[PDB]
């Protein structure tokens, strides 16, 4: 099924034809015709929203991978630092950040130093990204630089590039949905997502989302 | 310096302002990463909202910090010096005393305060929006005249400089007010107590 | 894929009779005994395959559902196991649907058999000749009154749905055969065997407790 043109897949199946905006002509990756609030009726705002969505999708994929991998590797020992939201305070402990369990890799003890270093490096990186030009010879596209960040040369055929763009906006959107689920589960049940999956697999009839429903009830 | 293409941008040496941000209006640092102001009407409404919010933020910050500093300076004993605890004073048996003096206000009824503030604020807001006794055909953003008794902002250059100073001071005041709110929410204490 | 001359065959890259030209749904080019070398016999075999597929899908669902309901504490049937469910008519009160005494309360097997014979004969005569529910045009894909939701409207979607139906029916037939031979070997329920195997996959299987007892 094609993902471009007037005969592309859409966000409501057979019912989509009645809610497709005029400005959503399917000229961009991930165009399913879903805009019911008219938030992208301005062409400039549409480009800004596309940029924000792509960046957020990439960061959400990174976050999902970095929340899933450390728990599986625990091949290592962390204890209370295995959980993704419980690893924030592991630096403040007087043992250091034992990367993979070895207390000799980074041995981080201070907060201000790492914080300031991250601020300066990512400020430089994000300022270069906003400028779009600098020390690296990119292709000139802010959203898809390619010149330096594609050492394998996977983006050479325009049609293959478009198909890859569709696939990775889709993977990014799935990552965004999963990250929102991770956040909500962390606030609600206070357990790691793998533990939640194990509890659900143990007995799915009673260990579902509606079991922890009355815990938010405001008592007088 | 503060106006035209020579103005500094919001990312230091890096400067990629949007097309619609020409810098004519005060406090234009080219920060529209969301693209919300692509329409002139929405941009103008956002400018008005920003300046009004800035003025209210500076006023609120001064009103939040002055009484608690005065209490901590050993001048007078307030009922509750903490800025986010001023509402509980009206429920005390002693009422609301200005600077602690029982002969100043001694307000007791919250309903009367609510009604009086509602009518007065509504009348002055309607005057500001439409034009009342304090001038009718004046600027909505900078009416001047009765609102500039000193006449400092008369010539264009000083007017623009003072407007830029107003906008940046108001932005700093808004950031400070948000910091006040977060600090109070987390620490459950006064701002100056956190400072010291 | 799934149609024309370049469709996927039944041996993947290791793969054909001349009469299997990639026109009919669910044609993977597996006819080694040459039983479908006659076009008329090919049509008859296709019709029997489709009917068997539908019947086997219904049978698999009806063999899984009551035992699944019973084992989860959702109902109390007289005999949840599928091969022992036919003896409920010889119990004290008879056959009660879902365990409720006020649902069917069947007691006589003769009446059941007579009514089933009459109704089944009438509807199968309608199927092969045409009756109240429509007139026969396509012997296995009537549509019209049997497709109220109109899912088989577009011809491309019709072909895709035909392929999906025939594949799910073939899988259902295989599972029906497995269910039969497991009943004739293990003597317990299908979901019971699944639960036992899931409890201890290494030690609970056909070879570990039944291979040596076969001979």
């Amino acid at each position: 099924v094609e993902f471009y043109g007037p005969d592309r897949a859409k966000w409501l199946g057979p019912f989509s034809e009645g809610s497709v905006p005029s400005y959503l002509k399917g000229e961009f990756p991930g165009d399913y015709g879903w805009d019911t609030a008219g938030l992208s009726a301005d062409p400039e705002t549409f480009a800004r929203y596309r940029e924000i969505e792509v960046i957020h999708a990439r960061w959400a994929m990174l976050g999902a991978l970095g929340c899933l991998t450390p728990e599986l590797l625990q091949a290592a020992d962390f204890g209370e630092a295995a959980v993704w939201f419980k690893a924030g305070a592991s630096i403040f402990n007087e043992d250091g950040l034992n990367y993979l369990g070895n207390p000799s890799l980074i041995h981080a003890q201070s907060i201000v130093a790492v914080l300031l270093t991250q601020l300066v490096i990512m400020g430089a990186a994000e300022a270069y990204r906003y400028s779009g030009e600098g020390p690296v010879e990119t292709s000139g596209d802010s959203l898809y630089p390619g010149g330096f960040f594609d050492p394998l040369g996977l983006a050479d055929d325009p049609d293959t590039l478009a198909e890859l763009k569709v696939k990775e906006i889709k993977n990014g959107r799935l990552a965004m949905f999963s990250m929102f689920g991770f956040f909500v589960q962390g606030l609600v049940t206070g357990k790691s997502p793998l533990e939640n999956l194990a509890d659900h697999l143990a007995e799915p009839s009673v260990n579902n989302g509606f079991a922890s429903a009355t815990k938010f009830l405001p008592l007088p | 310096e503060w106006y035209g293409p020579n103005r500094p941008q919001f990312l230091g040496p890096f400067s990629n302002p949007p097309s619609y941000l020409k810098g004519e209006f005060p406090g234009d640092y080219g920060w529209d990463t969301a693209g919300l102001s692509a329409d002139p009407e929405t941009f103008a409404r956002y400018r008005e909202l920003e300046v009004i919010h800035a003025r209210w933020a500076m006023l609120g910050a001064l009103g939040c910090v002055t009484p608690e500093l005065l209490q901590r300076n050993g001048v007078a004993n307030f009922g509750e010096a903490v800025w986010f605890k001023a509402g509980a004073q009206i429920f005390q048996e002693g009422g609301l005393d200005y600077l602690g003096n029982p002969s100043l206000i001694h307000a007791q009824s919250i309903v009367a305060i609510l009604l009086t503030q509602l009518v007065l604020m509504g009348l002055i807001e309607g005057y500001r929006v439409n034009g009342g006794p304090a001038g009718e055909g004046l600027d909505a953003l900078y009416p001047g005249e009765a609102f500039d008794p000193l006449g400092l902002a008369d010539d264009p250059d000083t007017f623009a400089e003072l407007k830029v100073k107003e906008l940046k001071n108001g932005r700093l005041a808004m950031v400070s007010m948000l910091g006040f709110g977060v600090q109070g929410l987390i620490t459950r204490k006064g701002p100056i107590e956190n400072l010291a | 894929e799934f149609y024309g001359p370049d469709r996927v065959k039944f041996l993947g890259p290791f793969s054909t009779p001349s009469y299997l030209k990639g026109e009919y749904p669910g044609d993977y080019g597996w006819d080694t005994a040459g039983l479908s070398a006659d076009p008329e016999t090919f049509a008859r075999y296709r019709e029997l395959e489709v009917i068997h597929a539908r019947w086997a899908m219904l049978g698999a669902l009806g063999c899984v559902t009551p035992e699944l309901l019973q084992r989860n504490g959702a109902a109390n049937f007289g005999e949840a196991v599928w091969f022992k469910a036919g003896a409920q008519i010889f119990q004290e009160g008879g056959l009660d649907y879902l365990g409720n005494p006020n649902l069917v309360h069947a007691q006589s097997i003769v009446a059941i058999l007579l009514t089933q014979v009459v109704l089944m004969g009438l509807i199968e005569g309608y199927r092969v000749n045409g009756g109240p529910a429509g007139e026969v045009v396509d012997p296995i894909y009537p549509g019209e009154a049997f497709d109220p939701l109109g899912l088989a409207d577009d011809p491309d979607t019709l072909a895709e749905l035909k392929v999906k139906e025939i594949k799910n029916g073939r899988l259902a037939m295989v599972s029906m055969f497995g269910f039969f031979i497991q009943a004739i070997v293990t003597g317990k329920g299908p979901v019971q065997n699944l639960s036992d195997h899931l409890a201890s996959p290494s030690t609970d299987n056909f070879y570990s407790l039944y291979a040596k007892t076969l001979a």
């Binding site: - | - | 109902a75 109390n76 879902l98 365990g99 409720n100 006020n102």
Partner: protein, 99 residues
């Protein structure tokens, strides 16, 4: 509704017979076969389907479908009362508390 009436059962029986007879004798007085089913007038105060249009036909279809459904439903009421010895809510309770 739990309130004892001030009438005797003999008086009530005679009154019911007389009132029903009078009402049905009034109803029988019509002569137009169309108005024998849809009298209108005082029986259509809101003037919902008193003209000749598509709106009245839909209302008549709804009325006839509701009539048929209620007829079958009351036959079910009677047969359930005969068999199980319960009413309507009683039959619902007996069915629910049997699984």
């Amino acid at each position: 509704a739990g309130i004892d009436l001030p009438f005797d059962i003999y008086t009530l029986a005679v009154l019911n017979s007389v009132l029903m007879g009078x009402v049905e004798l009034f109803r029988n007085s019509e002569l137009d076969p169309e108005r024998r089913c849809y009298p209108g007038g005082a029986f259509d105060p809101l003037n919902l389907a008193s003209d000749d249009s598509e709106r009245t036909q839909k209302l008549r279809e709804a009325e006839i479908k509701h009539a048929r459904l209620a007829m079958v439903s009351f036959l079910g009421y009677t047969v359930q009362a005969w068999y199980t010895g319960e009413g309507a809510l009683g039959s619902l309770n007996k069915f629910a508390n049997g699984f």
